[PDB]
Design a binder for this molecule. Structure first.
Ligand SMILES: CCCCCCCC/C=C\CCCCCCCC(=O)OC[C@H](O)CO
Ligand SMILES: CCCCCCCC/C=C\CCCCCCCC(=O)OC[C@H](O)CO
Ligand SMILES: CCCCCCCC/C=C\CCCCCCCC(=O)OC[C@H](O)CO
Ligand SMILES: CCCCCCCC/C=C\CCCCCCCC(=O)OC[C@H](O)CO
Ligand SMILES: CCCCCCCC/C=C\CCCCCCCC(=O)OC[C@H](O)CO
Ligand SMILES: CCCCCCCC/C=C\CCCCCCCC(=O)OC[C@H](O)CO
Ligand SMILES: CCCCCCCCCCCCCCCCCCCC
Ligand SMILES: CCCCCCCCCCCCCCCCCCCC
Ligand SMILES: CCCCCCCCCCCCCCCCCCCC
Ligand SMILES: CCCCCCCCCCCCCCCCCCCC
Ligand SMILES: CCCCCCCCCCCCCCCCCCCC
Ligand SMILES: CCCCCCCCCCCCCCCCCCCC
Ligand SMILES: CCCCCCCCCCCCCCCCCCCC
Ligand SMILES: CCCCCCCCCCCCCCCCCCCC
Ligand SMILES: CCCCCCCCCCCCCCCCCCCC
Ligand SMILES: CCCCCCCCCCCCCCCCCCCC
Ligand SMILES: CCCCCCCCCCCCCCCCCCCC
Ligand SMILES: CCCCCCCCCCCCCCCCCCCC
Ligand SMILES: CCCCCCCCCCCCCCCCCCCC
Ligand SMILES: CCCCCCCCCCCCCCCCCCCC
Ligand SMILES: CCCCCCCCCCCCCCCCCCCC
Ligand SMILES: CCCCCCCCCCCCCCCCCCCC
Ligand SMILES: CCCCCCCCCCCCCCCCCCCC
Ligand SMILES: CCCCCCCCCCCCCCCCCCCC
Ligand SMILES: CCCCCCCCCCCCCCCCCCCC
Ligand SMILES: CCCCCCCCCCCCCCCCCCCC
Ligand SMILES: CCCCCCCCCCCCCCCCCCCC
Ligand SMILES: CCCCCCCCO[C@@H]1O[C@H](CO)[C@@H](O)[C@H](O)[C@H]1O
Ligand SMILES: CCCCCCCCO[C@@H]1O[C@H](CO)[C@@H](O)[C@H](O)[C@H]1O
Ligand SMILES: CCCCCCCCO[C@@H]1O[C@H](CO)[C@@H](O)[C@H](O)[C@H]1O
Ligand code: NA
Ligand code: NA
Ligand code: NA
Ligand code: NA
Ligand code: NA
Ligand code: NA
Lengths: 411, 411, 411
């Protein structure tokens, strides 16, 4: 029930700030957060079953050729929106000018960012050498790959002349479809707990980081969140309408994944809600079962935009000036970064470091590190918004593609 | 066949002691033990399939509400019996006074015990973020959690108005039930090898550690084993009868898991036998599929009792006196310890260290370490008994709960 | 299509050598190899599903007793052919005298070989303590073990008097058989990409290592490849014909796995092709589903032969002379080595080190290391041939056993 999570969101926000103000933050950490973390875990639990099972069923429902057209379409969409995101972040930064006048003292946290594996590696790894391992290690891309191959192959089998082959292929499908159906059913149950979860999650963030949102760090929050707002209005909404979708209808249907993403701060972990949203939008499983898990890992408009704003904040705080040529470099790098970290765990951190280095602000610089460490103080706050844009772009792309594919039913 | 394993148990015991006496222990290690270790592996092999599959089928057979009442009931039972166990160990220690007069020289083995993760962590981890990972990593609690959720959800699906949904849910169930049935079938085969396995296992223990059972270490063995005996007679038997179960009937049915636990020294690894025992007792799968795997990981009366006796042995050997207040502390800590190590691998070692530290005998003390190292010399001997009490308590709880739940058939 | 891969093999070979000669090797590394590596990954992807599923179906189709006779038969075959292989390598070495006159300077690469776990360990580990873990970790032997047990048990279940038990066992079988069928279907698709894959793979090897094949390293290549040829002609062919199989028919059917092994340099990774080959030979799934995965891990005639030739090359390069008694030692050790590394990852490297040490040439000797490092320069070249003999022996054994088992249909 929407009312209820919205109450949880609002109540938790304010109680978090109140308790955080009176230095009862470590109480919230101890006694409250747990109930939030549970919600997250409960959702994450569904991910690898619901992604795998849904895709096998989906991949087997529609023609390979359509799937491939779907793939081209969304990939292009994911690329363009990402590029506009990081761009919009630069604009947002140049307009609001966060991080300026800051003269931080070196010391405190240092980082040695992990290096992104080469692009070839990352592409190759889309193909699992062991699908059972990919499922157990929770690797989404390889799971996507195998699910599709298996689904396609199942369809061939069901067109066999030998009944025995047909029947055993049907059984596997039905079993896997049983699992898919089950995971959607479980989502409905989990979402009853959402109010308590949503409450506890936001409460903790507000109690911990709500307080830190002051001075220049408020400028960053503003720039970021105005940026994120603008991506939704000026990009998604406009696009949705161009392709004959009512933005309000979409929000109406999408609201559940959007709210879950915001608090959960997990694109991956919101997937089950996202995927149910698309189902309830009446989108073909042959589409969203592919696009949404893909988008969840490679399509992060929120993050892109943040990377722009963060690069400028750090540059400002060091008194660096970013030429237009450097601004170009940021966009390019941001786009490449998300491609070249596609499967990689903790890809957000790596990307940022790549983007920062592209304009000569290595995180291994003590002055850069001081600046970064400052903005990290409120990352949870930032992460909520940007995660939610991350998910919302997936549904937008999925909606748009679904819409251009017109009528589409199983074979 | 019972006769046969009892012969294996007895033959192996005596041949182990004979060979061990004549310094042919490393022969037994080399050429005999392997056949025992095989038996253990063969049983362990069934665990994660039979736990998962059985629970899905079970969770789907009975109402959630009943399952929850079942859960409350056994948890309470597991708590009370654990508390009495460790208590009975203290009593057993104060009566027999093991470890007294010992003045060990420092040196030899040292330990740095692993720390137990915080209680919140341990509770949260009951919920797997990846069930395929939990299955592959052999994590029982999270597997229990997911199995139940999946089973419940399958039942909802089978009440669907859409035939297609019903059918695919049925298929998944039947597939999983096939796997469950298969694992029970395999147990029957494995247990034919039990005589050889039981023989080799006990032979090795007697040949290695049988000899060490002398002086104060005999006092410890006595105290422990008298303790373990007393738990069965004064606790399980009495309880069984209060709840209208014949202790001899129970033993008659239970004997197989009891004997397997004793030699196998693995609660987890005995599970398949335990779970077959409960089936042959005619207990609802909706009950024992839940209670027995749970009890197997969190309900260890044998270990609790040992912890009591071990704390006193170490204290005695150092000339420490344990006030009544400290004795209280041991009980509490022992109980908490098993809760706060629920999922954790090598939880036995951690628990003991926690209990020892609770009364000011840290294992990082060279004098404590010398004392502990002494009792470790015969841990295999000790472990046999205590493992068997560990398993037996599970069946007792399961029997009692099953009995209070009265008539119970699938929906 | 055969024509096409043969064109890929030939084209790639020559273009590799041409580009390699003109110092464009790192181009081939960068822009070509990827397409080859993809082919390998695509095949590896099928391995654990197709091995597991095929064996369950197979083990359930034929009587345990037959399976056991099959097992004895192939094991014996695997042992004899291995012994002849390493022997033939010694002969090949004494005839061609590779490595003689070489006086290498110490320095460059050093190795500390991993130690093989004890034989008992390796045998025990055939039995998985967690089959889900064995599947996810891609452990073949334990997967073989469990698949067989599960398959046998399924058959018992299907002879049950209770319909419910029968039906749920059937469903599991059909589901698993669906998966098996699917993997074979996928192989057919993958093999359409083979021409491009085969091209890129060979191109890279020729561009990288083709050039290094000169002087004494040419002598080694010759000795090895003549050896490998001779194993096929004098051993497999002769054996095939003794047991009433036409060598050319066999090659005709086998060619696909042979060519895939050669380029792929992965016995494991060729399995899916190998297993399809045997199916198309009309061999019982109850046989090849067992023998081929087994042979793929423990039966490596190519490697054995190489080990012989490599031991002599190293000995020659150091000016060591190998007595007839030492030559005996090599054979024995080579045979034992493959047994005592059965499941072990990177078993090839370990085996070689064991064999080298058996005659007093430890890889930790800087002079030995220099010699070994030299031959490593062309290992890819060597590996192609020896991998292909490795696979071919599996099909030969499988064909021979299948043939001696006469008519064999499901129960
Ligand atoms: C459904 C509509 C309701 C939406 C409302 C849901 C709550 C959103 C919370 C944060 C969003 C990001 C804004 C960050 C807020 C920071 C709090 C703050 O400014 O506190 C500073 C401190 O009080 C001075 O020292
Ligand atoms: C940042 C997004 C800004 C605004 C989205 C808010 C849109 C609010 C959605 C309410 C629309 C609604 O409830 O009505 C639709 C339907 O006609 C009822 O029957
Ligand atoms: C079914 C009824 C048959 C039950 C019998 C099964 C065997 C039980 C073995 C050990 C249990 C614990 C007792 C430990 C025995 C230690 C042996 C011992 O005392 O030997 C000392 C040595 O001989 C002096 O130097
Ligand atoms: C420590 C446990 C102590 C004693 C349990 C031994 C109980 C022995 C069980 C034998 C009872 C029995 O075999 O008889 C039951 C039935 O009536 C036959 O038809
Ligand atoms: C189907 C029939 C066609 C079969 C053909 C497929 C290609 C086989 C390639 C290598 C095999 C092993 C031989 C190794 C060849 C080494 C190349 C070489 O000798 O080059 C040295 C260099 O040119 C001087 O500096
Ligand atoms: C090293 C192996 C050496 C030679 C194998 C080459 C054998 C070539 C196989 C060609 C035989 C063939 O194609 O003909 C069989 C059939 O009769 C057509 O209809
Ligand atoms: C900024 C707030 C804009 C809208 C918030 C309205 C309150 C939501 C409460 C909903 C309860 C039904
Ligand atoms: C006519 C036959 C076409 C078969 C297509 C089968 C499925 C196509 C999949 C879509 C391809 C588009 C690329 C999507 C891959 C994701 C990119 C990852 C970048 C890190
Ligand atoms: C018919 C047109 C095909 C639609 C493909 C989706 C691309 C959306 C455009 C993105 C602009 C940023
Ligand atoms: C603890 C929270 C429980 C999660 C509820 C999931 C069960 C819902 C089953 C589908 C109706
Ligand atoms: C138009 C939406 C923008 C939301 C603004 C977020 C709040 C900025 C920082 C407020 C702290 C003072
Ligand atoms: C009805 C569909 C209309 C499609 C129009 C395509 C315009 C795409 C705009 C992309 C902006 C970069
Ligand atoms: C079916 C009837 C539903 C009524 C309309 C509900 C619309 C709710 C609007 C939610 C849109 C965004 C949700 C995310 C909120 C993020 C937190 C706000 C702080 C920036
Ligand atoms: C202490 C021994 C108590 C009972 C042992 C009886 C011997 C068991 C042999 C059973 C063979 C049928
Ligand atoms: C009326 C709806 C109730 C739904 C209950 C669903 C299943 C209940 C499970 C039993 C709950 C009791 C607690 C058992 C958890 C194990 C404790 C672990 C401690 C480490
Ligand atoms: C009806 C009573 C409910 C039974 C619950 C089991 C608890 C057993 C009591 C344990 C005492 C140590
Ligand atoms: C080696 C020991 C073999 C284990 C036997 C299990 C097979 C039994 C199948 C069910 C009848
Ligand atoms: C009543 C059951 C108690 C069994 C006693 C175990 C043997 C104690 C140590 C014997 C070694 C001398
Ligand atoms: C028939 C059932 C009788 C139940 C009696 C309950 C007594 C529980 C004793 C617990 C001791 C702590
Ligand atoms: C159906 C007929 C069965 C006859 C009765 C069998 C009863 C056997 C008693 C076994 C009870 C405990 C088994 C574990 C033995 C532990 C080793 C003893 C040393 C302490
Ligand atoms: C050495 C070469 C021996 C046979 C090679 C023949 C060329 C193969 C081309 C086949 C195309 C149909
Ligand atoms: C009459 C009952 C026989 C049951 C046999 C069940 C299956 C037999 C399997 C074949 C046994 C031969 C040994 C093969 C094991 C592989 C050896 C690995 C060496 C590293
Ligand atoms: C009938 C004979 C049984 C066949 C067993 C296969 C062994 C093959 C002989 C190998 C010789 C190297
Ligand atoms: C990229 C290469 C695609 C691999 C093709 C496998 C799909 C074949 C399905 C069975 C016909
Ligand atoms: C009879 C098959 C033997 C193939 C010979 C392989 C080539 C040896 C090295 C050639 C390089 C000069
Ligand atoms: C028709 C089958 C004939 C079998 C002959 C057996 C000979 C095996 C030769 C082995 C050589 C070591
Ligand atoms: C069905 C018609 C097929 C025609 C006959 C095809 C026979 C091809 C012969 C291939 C045999 C070996 C294949 C591996 C080649 C290894 C590379 C050669 C260099 C040593
Ligand atoms: C406003 C909420 C989002 C709507 C997204 C529009 C995408 C339409 O979705 C499409 O609709 C077709 C017609 O029913 C179906 O046949 C297709 O399977 C489906 O993909
Ligand atoms: C003495 C061996 C242990 C017996 C345990 C008694 C628990 C009874 O078990 C119960 O029996 C009911 C009546 O048949 C069944 O309907 C229930 O499913 C079952 O849980
Ligand atoms: C030349 C290609 C290899 C041929 C291998 C010969 C092995 C024969 O294979 C056997 O044939 C029998 C008769 O059809 C079948 O009933 C058996 O299932 C099968 O194992
Ligand atoms: Na994007
Ligand atoms: Na996304
Ligand atoms: Na207990
Ligand atoms: Na237990
Ligand atoms: Na061999
Ligand atoms: Na092989």
């Amino acid at each position: 029930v929407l009312q209820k999570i919205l109450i949880g969101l609002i109540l938790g926000a304010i109680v978090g700030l109140i308790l955080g103000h009176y230095g009862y933050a470590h109480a919230v950490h101890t006694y409250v957060k747990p109930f939030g973390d549970l919600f997250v875990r409960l959702l994450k639990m569904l991910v690898m079953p619901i992604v795998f099972a849904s895709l096998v069923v989906g991949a087997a429902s529609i023609s390979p050729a359509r799937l491939g057209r779907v793939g081209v379409k969304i990939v292009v969409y994911y690329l363009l929106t990402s590029a506009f995101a990081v761009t919009l972040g630069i604009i947002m930064a140049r307009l609001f000018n966060p991080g300026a006048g800051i003269h931080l003292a070196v010391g405190g946290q240092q980082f040695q960012p992990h290096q992104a594996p080469p692009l070839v590696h990352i592409l190759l790894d889309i193909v699992p050498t062991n699908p059972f391992g990919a499922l157990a290690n929770g690797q989404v891309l390889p799971t996507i790959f195998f699910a599709i191959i298996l689904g396609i192959a199942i369809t061939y089998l069901m067109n066999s002349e030998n009944e025995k082959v047909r029947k055993s292929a049907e059984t596997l499908l039905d079993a896997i479809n049983g699992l898919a159906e089950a995971m959607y059913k479980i989502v409905n149950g989990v979402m009853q707990y959402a109010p308590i979860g949503v409450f506890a999650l936001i409460a903790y963030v507000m109690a911990e980081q709500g307080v830190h949102v002051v001075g220049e760090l408020a400028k960053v929050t503003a720039a970021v969140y105005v940026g994120l707002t603008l991506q939704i209005l000026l990009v998604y909404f406009v696009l949705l309408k161009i392709y004959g979708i009512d933005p309000i209808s979409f929000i109406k249907h999408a609201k559940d994944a959007m709210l879950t993403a915001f608090v959960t701060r997990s694109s991956s972990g919101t997937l089950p809600v996202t995927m149910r949203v698309a189902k309830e939008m009446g989108i073909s499983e042959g589409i969203y079962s592919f696009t949404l898990p893909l988008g969840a890992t490679i399509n992060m408009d929120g993050t892109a935009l943040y990377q722009g704003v963060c690069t400028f904040f750090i540059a400002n705080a060091l008194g660096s000036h970013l030429t237009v040529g450097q601004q170009l470099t940021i966009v390019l790098t941001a786009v490449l970064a998300s491609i070249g970290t596609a499967g990689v765990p903790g890809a957000g951190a790596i990307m940022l470091a790549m983007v920062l280095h592209s304009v000569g602000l290595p995180l291994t610089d003590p002055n850069v590190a001081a600046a970064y460490a400052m903005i990290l103080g409120i990352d949870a706050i930032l992460d909520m918004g940007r995660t939610m844009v991350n998910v919302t772009g997936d549904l937008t792309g999925t909606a748009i593609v679904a819409k251009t594919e017109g009528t589409l039913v199983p074979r």
